[PDB]
Amino acid sequence: DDDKVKLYKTNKYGTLYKSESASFTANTDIITRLTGPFRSMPQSGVLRKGLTIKYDEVMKQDGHVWVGYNTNSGKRVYLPVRTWNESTGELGPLWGTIK
């Protein structure tokens, strides 16, 4: 029920998103995506376990919750951080820590 405490909007891709600037520290090697929060998008790279990134957006799309951030080169990356059951709203365990 995060939409009860945070403002969410919907974009042209049908993605539910909220503006949020925090830090995410991965507890596993995560595959990132380019252009948007879809596993069908080209792979951007891999966020290694233990690394921390600062994101500015949180999105719900393609069965996961994702965070958006920019790398040191300015490349926009979409990082999946947990599963999201679109048919129930059920969220899987966070694949790291948020602060």
From Swiss-Prot:
Entry keyword set: Cell wall biogenesis/degradation, Hydrolase, Metal-binding, Metalloprotease, Protease, Repeat, Secreted, Signal, Zinc
As one GO molecular function, the record gives:
metal ion binding
Q: Which residues form the SH3b domain?
A: 19-87
GO cellular-component terms in the record? extracellular region
**Subcellular location(s) of the protein:** Secreted
Give the principal location in a single coarse category: secreted
Write out the GO biological process terms: cell wall organization; proteolysis
Describe the task this protein carries out.
Lyses staphylococcal cells by hydrolyzing the polyglycine interpeptide bridges of the peptidoglycan.
Similarity annotation: Belongs to the peptidase M23B family.
What name does UniProt use for this protein? Glycyl-glycine endopeptidase ALE-1
Q: Which residues of the complete protein does this chain represent?
A: 271 to 362 of 362
